[PDB]
Design a protein around this ligand. Structure first.
Ligand code: MG
Ligand code: MG
Ligand code: MG
Ligand code: MG
Ligand code: MG
Ligand code: MG
Ligand code: MG
Ligand code: MG
Ligand code: MG
Ligand code: MG
Ligand code: MG
Ligand code: MG
Ligand code: MG
Ligand code: MG
Ligand code: MG
Ligand code: MG
Ligand code: MG
Ligand code: MG
Ligand code: MG
Ligand code: MG
Ligand code: MG
Ligand code: MG
Ligand code: MG
Ligand code: MG
Ligand code: MG
Ligand code: MG
Ligand code: MG
Ligand code: MG
Ligand code: MG
Ligand code: MG
Ligand code: MG
Ligand code: MG
Ligand code: MG
Ligand code: MG
Ligand code: MG
Ligand code: MG
Ligand code: MG
Ligand code: MG
Ligand code: MG
Ligand code: MG
Ligand code: MG
Ligand code: MG
Ligand code: MG
Ligand code: MG
Ligand code: MG
Ligand code: MG
Ligand code: MG
Ligand code: MG
Ligand code: MG
Ligand code: MG
Ligand code: MG
Ligand code: MG
Ligand code: MG
Ligand code: MG
Ligand code: MG
Ligand code: MG
Ligand code: MG
Ligand code: MG
Ligand code: MG
Ligand code: MG
Ligand code: MG
Ligand code: MG
Ligand code: MG
Ligand code: MG
Ligand code: MG
Lengths: 210, 147
RNA sequence: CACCCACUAAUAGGGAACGUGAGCUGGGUUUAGACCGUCGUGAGACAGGUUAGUUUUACCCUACUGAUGAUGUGUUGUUGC
RNA sequence: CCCACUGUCCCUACCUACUAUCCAGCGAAACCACAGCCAAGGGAACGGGCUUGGCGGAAUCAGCGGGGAAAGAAGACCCUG
RNA sequence: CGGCGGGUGUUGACGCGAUGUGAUUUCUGCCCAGUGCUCUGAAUGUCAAAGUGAAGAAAUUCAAUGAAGCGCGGGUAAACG
RNA sequence: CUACGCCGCGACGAGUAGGAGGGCCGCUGCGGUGAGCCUUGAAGCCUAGGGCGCGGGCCCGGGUGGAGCCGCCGCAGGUGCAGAUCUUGGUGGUAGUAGCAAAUAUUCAAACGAGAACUUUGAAGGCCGAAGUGGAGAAGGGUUCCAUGUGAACAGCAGUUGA
RNA sequence: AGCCCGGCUCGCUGGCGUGGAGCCGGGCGUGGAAUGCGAGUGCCUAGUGGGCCACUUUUGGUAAGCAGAACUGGCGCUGCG
RNA sequence: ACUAAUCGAACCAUCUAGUAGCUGGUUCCCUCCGAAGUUUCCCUCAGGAUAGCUGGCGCUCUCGCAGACCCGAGCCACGCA
RNA sequence: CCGACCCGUCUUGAAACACGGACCAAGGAGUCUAACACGUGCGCGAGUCGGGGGCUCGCACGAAAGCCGCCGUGGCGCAAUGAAGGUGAAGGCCGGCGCGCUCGCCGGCCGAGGUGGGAUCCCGAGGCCUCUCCAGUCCGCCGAGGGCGCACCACCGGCCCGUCUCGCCCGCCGCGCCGGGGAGGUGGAGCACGAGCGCACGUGUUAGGACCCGAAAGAUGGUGAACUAUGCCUGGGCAGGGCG
RNA sequence: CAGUAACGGCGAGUGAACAGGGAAGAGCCCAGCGCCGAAUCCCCGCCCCGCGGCGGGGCGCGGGACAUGUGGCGUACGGAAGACCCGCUCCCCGGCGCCGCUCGUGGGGGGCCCAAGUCCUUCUGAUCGAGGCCCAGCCCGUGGACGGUGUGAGGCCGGUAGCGGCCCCCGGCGCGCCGGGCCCGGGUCUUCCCGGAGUCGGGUUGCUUGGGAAUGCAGCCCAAAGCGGGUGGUAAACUCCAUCUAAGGCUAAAUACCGGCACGAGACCGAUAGUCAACAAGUACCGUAAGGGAAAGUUGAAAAGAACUUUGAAGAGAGAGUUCAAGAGGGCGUGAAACCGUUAAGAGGUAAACGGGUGGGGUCCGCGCAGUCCGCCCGGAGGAUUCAACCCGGCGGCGGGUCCGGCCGUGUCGGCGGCCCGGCGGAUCUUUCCCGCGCGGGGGACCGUCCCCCGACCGGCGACCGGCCGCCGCCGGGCGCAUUUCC
């Protein structure tokens, strides 16, 4: 029964909710267990990075987030084949790969391959037999420089290319942004019907004189 | 704190603050929003006009991301840059004007509420209001579009 | 209620939770069974008719009926008002 | 309805057995706001209590069925949902 | 619930199954308008899905044909009445 | 002059349903604090003991008891009962009352025994009266069968007797 | 927030510097009846939504401790003489 | 009628603490304020919503706070009933 | 001696011949979560909040506390309006010009308009002082009028969105069934120099067992023909007379 | 995201997904097309090495499966084969001996151990209580959790703390060896090969979903294609684009856990509470059965559990005895109310009971019973340091142009002072000194807070402190020994 002014409320408590209640009293214990598992994994892979394989530079999909860049699942095969890395060797040296990702534009391709090349530059690789250094790396730089890497490998950062102050040109002053946007919307709306009307007029034009 | 509640002051009063005549019964009048058109019609009409019926077109699978276009007014525009930028532009001997990219600040449309300080500035935005454009031009600034 | 028979001095009228069911009876109404007439398509209904249909407890308080006793005259008894 | 028959009745009495009664032993339950003498008044329009009057004498026994609008069952009749 | 499942049926019209009335005797009148039941499809009215044809660029729209049933026509009351 | 304190003046004081404030009213537990209390006697309970407060209640004396308890500042409630034909448990009046009244019936002597209407033996009078109150089985019971011993409880009186 | 002087605006109105409204300055306090009282405004909100009675007015009814209205007061919610 | 003292739909467990506008109950003190049984709508008439009546929280102002004991030195508040 | 009917409850009305209560002890009924709304307290404040994750000898307390900041993703707020395509909140004064045509192009300033109230504050003529004066020195109080006017209220303007009516102009890499602008009414949960966010507490409403106790019922799955009802199988039993 | 899009007698109500941020993160294998002398697999006999989960190897003119298709390469991320060039890159399997010793400090399981008062004096039935323990304080403390012990215990005991010790067993990590398997990878060019059918899809029906001209599922009917097919949240035709590749298969982690094994904890309950069950509880008992299902904790430190005398047939008594206590005596801690017995006191014919007012009686309380005190002064009778005032020493309060420092706050100066020899930031400008195409990351300059600094001015000693003085006050020690002062 309503009483005076008040919001109309629709509680979703008509479906016998008490038998399905999730209590979070094990949340601190869950956090402790996750931390212990993290430390155990990090100790298991001794010189390898704690977080794991390097992840690619990835722009977020929709129009809300496409200004933001993030980390992806793994490097595309095109990035690997132009960076000179076999797609089956990459996973052995800590490079995540994603066979189902394509590269629609070249700029992201170049960014990811420079990421791969710089990572390969920073990589320290142990030989399979420590007493038989075959082709991996030199012992001088892997003795005391081999460190467990904490956090994500080469973290993804939003970079904002600063543009400096400049004297405003006249052709910027005479630009009509609102008018341009309105006319762009109008042209996008009326493009197809304009094409149809032009085609109709052309059809009437090629039979007007008879 | 149950010691600060009205139940502790109602001990010894038989009706517990609910009356002797009408009493406190389970659900007189219905459960929830029962009878919004029959016997609670006055309350719904008086406090929730427009509650009953359909208006407008229904659009299946609305994606809120598609129409994401946050806005910024002109009076708050200069807050998107550091005060160092502002003072450098203001005291500048030449006619150099700074460039403010609102998309970097997370805004897509520049709205026209408020007024601007009288100094030129370049504004990078996806969409501009007509009055916002007029006010930016009036202070000698320029508007440019980004995609 | 009524009506008649007969006697009679007269066969007056009424109340008491329309006196009186832990006093009775259960003939009637007014459960369930059943038949008839009318009504209803039917289930069924009928201040319409007919038949069969469990009438429980007092040892409590008072009231009443009896039965002892109690108060006071020192005890006790007789005769008495 | 008739004959016969008889305590159904006039109109009640007497007798017999088991109780009831008293005693020894044994020993419950129902019910219980407090309780328990009336008339009238007023009152939720029929009082045990209140007002006014009548009055009021320990403790009990055997009966009793006038009252406790007695007990037994949150009326089964009527209405409402 | 289901199986070519099962009861009557180890049966076959003097048998199973479904009804009404209620021995014997004597009778069981009239009504087929209504509601049922049932016979006939006779050109046959209406009539779903599927199918057929046409318009359309297609969804679709329209049209034609017309199974039971209902109407139309008989019969039936020891069918309800 | 604990300023959340102290002091002054004036007016006023009904109250169901209901609302609000204050509670140095009360119960339980937690964080603080009282160099708190306690086997030279805690909690609890009893009390014709002394008081305080408008009241909720509180302090002290005496007795019992035998190991824990309280005050103040905050915190948190499964926090206050006369009712609900309330739940559980206990106890009254009724009340030494109703009652121990269906199927004819018991009596005498003796023994054991602390104790006899009821046990046992003998005598007498009766009943079932062969469709039995007799003699045996099925179902069901499950040791009730038999012997000895006991007299706590049961056998609605008793018991020396008994399933 | 009244009265009186000027002046200004109007796209309304119009013989007219007309009318009407609005606006801007100035001067007028004897505060333009009595009596009493300090006012204004906002948010949240419980309970209630069976009423009854009396003077007077009054409708239906033979009437009613009947049924229904107006006004005030009371009972409900209220003790005291 | 009978279907284990249960039959106009047995018994057991669960859904189930089923729902109830209806009945019953609803636990300490003092202080302050303090009602309504009326309007409108409702398959509404034993109930709600709604306005009204109530309480709480305030907030905006109004007369001043006069002389350290002394002692005023035409005109005496916004506004309200 | 005076006064004094039994409480609780429903009720217009209870001491009622209205219901519950024989007595005593213990238990016994507005709770928790979620979501709102308003008020109050606290922190920060056009911001606010780490609540999920992570980092710190992993753990007496500690399942706490602390920290993250390129963990602020995100939530709420900071912008509304329309069904939607979409659009989307600043004017005043002094000017020179068209033609200052109810308006088109710029300047300069100011920075959300005005009216009536408006606590507070400011100026303030004139007064109050002593043993007295002609003479002015420093500050205090009362003070008629006047001024700036907070919040808030009423009003009149103004701005944004939707929708009508009228009418005239402007823009261009797309010269268009293109885009834009004006004036006058009207619809909005708007603007008009922010007030919100987080946490706690109280009250009210609601969904949940929902203050406690209460149905007649409904559904699902099982157990019963040891009683009765009926059919079948296999056993057992029923003196003595009368009629004829 | 979001109580949103949407569903809903569009009523009550219902109600996802994408993107974003995190936890975790791992990918793959067939069929098919092919190529390779079936290359493949199971069983059984013999031998060797083993046992510990029954395998490795060798042999069989030893059987069987299998061409109606085993195995190797190969899977949509393309693949295969030839050539050319480049690079030898080193795998996994189970033991032999040992180190790191497995590791937040043992890897796990089990076992046995490791500090310090029963000191003195006292309380008590018993004490773990109370007082003390000179050296800065009884002793240990990496141990002051807990439990037991006749109370209340860090030191009596078990434990507790400890990268403490010792012993036994078990498991996975590197090296040299052992037995054997183990077979070419990448880049370029050329030539070939490429896919899952009663399935998709369509109609219809029923259910389901937020899925709305139909989200998903299923039945029935129809029934595919290969520049094909599916999806692109409004039915349909035409057209472009995007995206994936169905009708075959496997896969750890993050995740769930009211049952089980073993633990830890709690602002929870405390015997009518908390599980139904603190106890011989799913027991006793009930019902034919399904099933229903309780009540019930406590002597005492220790049985020391009442010897023995006596009455009674005994139950039960009176004595006695144990104990600190039986006024703790085998359902025995405490022992309320209701109700009952007795004793004492009082009263009684309007049922009791109650409010107000007194009176009488009674049990008690008042250390009641010759009634308070104490500041000054006066008088008397006695004492005693010492009273005042001065001297020495100490300490406090107040004031001082800051007398002197230490300073403090606001600014103010040149910044010698910091990107080497001070920081933190900046949506501020830059190599026109430095490594990534004319395309970054560095390093610089600048700005703003600044870091302590060198000094000075300003107001002050402030409630930030000291030294000096001057005053005041107090105390201790002298003198002061009497008309003072005090008792
Ligand atoms: Mg009240
Ligand atoms: Mg009512
Ligand atoms: Mg009568
Ligand atoms: Mg009678
Ligand atoms: Mg009777
Ligand atoms: Mg009769
Ligand atoms: Mg009958
Ligand atoms: Mg009969
Ligand atoms: Mg008798
Ligand atoms: Mg009378
Ligand atoms: Mg009833
Ligand atoms: Mg009934
Ligand atoms: Mg027949
Ligand atoms: Mg006939
Ligand atoms: Mg036909
Ligand atoms: Mg005929
Ligand atoms: Mg009052
Ligand atoms: Mg409670
Ligand atoms: Mg009680
Ligand atoms: Mg009560
Ligand atoms: Mg008797
Ligand atoms: Mg007898
Ligand atoms: Mg005989
Ligand atoms: Mg026999
Ligand atoms: Mg006996
Ligand atoms: Mg025997
Ligand atoms: Mg009336
Ligand atoms: Mg009332
Ligand atoms: Mg009143
Ligand atoms: Mg009155
Ligand atoms: Mg309606
Ligand atoms: Mg009622
Ligand atoms: Mg009642
Ligand atoms: Mg009534
Ligand atoms: Mg009453
Ligand atoms: Mg009466
Ligand atoms: Mg009655
Ligand atoms: Mg009743
Ligand atoms: Mg009763
Ligand atoms: Mg009761
Ligand atoms: Mg209680
Ligand atoms: Mg934390
Ligand atoms: Mg964000
Ligand atoms: Mg104003
Ligand atoms: Mg306006
Ligand atoms: Mg509300
Ligand atoms: Mg309930
Ligand atoms: Mg129920
Ligand atoms: Mg139903
Ligand atoms: Mg049978
Ligand atoms: Mg939201
Ligand atoms: Mg659903
Ligand atoms: Mg992660
Ligand atoms: Mg093959
Ligand atoms: Mg101990
Ligand atoms: Mg200890
Ligand atoms: Mg030890
Ligand atoms: Mg240890
Ligand atoms: Mg579409
Ligand atoms: Mg207890
Ligand atoms: Mg229990
Ligand atoms: Mg039985
Ligand atoms: Mg005995
Ligand atoms: Mg004792
Ligand atoms: Mg005891």
């Amino acid at each position: 029964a309503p009483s005076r002014n008040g919001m109309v409320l629709k509680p979703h408590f008509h479906k016998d909710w008490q038998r399905r209640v999730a209590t979070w009293f094990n949340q601190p214990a869950r956090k402790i267990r996750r931390r212990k598992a993290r430390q155990a994994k990090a100790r298991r892979i001794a010189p390898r990075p704690a977080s794991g394989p390097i992840r690619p530079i990835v722009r977020c999909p929709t129009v809300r987030y496409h200004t933001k860049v993030r980390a992806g699942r793994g490097f595309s095969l095109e990035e690997l084949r132009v960076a000179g890395i076999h797609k089956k060797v990459a996973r052995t040296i800590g490079i995540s790969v994603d066979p189902r990702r394509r590269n629609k534009s070249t700029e992201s391709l170049q960014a990811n391959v420079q990421r791969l090349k710089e990572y390969r530059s920073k990589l320290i690789l142990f030989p399979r037999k420590p007493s038989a250094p075959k082709k991996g790396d030199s012992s001088a730089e892997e003795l005391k420089l081999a460190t467990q890497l904490t956090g994500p490998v080469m973290p993804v950062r939003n970079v904002y290319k600063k543009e400096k102050a400049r004297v405003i040109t006249e052709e910027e002053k005479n630009f009509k942004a609102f008018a341009s946007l309105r006319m762009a919307r109008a042209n996008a709306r009326l493009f197809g019907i304009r094409a149809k009307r032009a085609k109709e007029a052309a059809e009437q034009d090629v039979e007007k004189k008879k | 704190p149950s010691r600060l509640r009205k139940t502790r002051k109602l001990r010894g009063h038989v009706s517990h603050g609910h009356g002797r005549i009408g009493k406190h019964r389970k659900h007189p009048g219905g459960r929830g929003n029962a009878g919004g058109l029959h016997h609670h019609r006055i309350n719904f009409d008086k406090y929730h006009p427009g509650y009953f019926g359909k208006v407008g077109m229904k659009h299946y699978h609305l994606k809120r991301n598609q129409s994401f276009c946050p806005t910024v007014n002109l009076d708050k525009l200069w807050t998107l840059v550091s005060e160092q930028t502002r003072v450098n532009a203001a005291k500048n001997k030449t006619g150099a004007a700074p460039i403010i990219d609102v998309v970097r600040s997370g805004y897509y449309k520049v709205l026209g509420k408020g007024k601007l300080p009288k100094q030129p500035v370049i504004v990078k935005a996806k969409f501009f209001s007509r009055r916002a454009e007029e006010k930016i031009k009036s202070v000698g600034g320029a508007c440019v579009l980004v995609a």
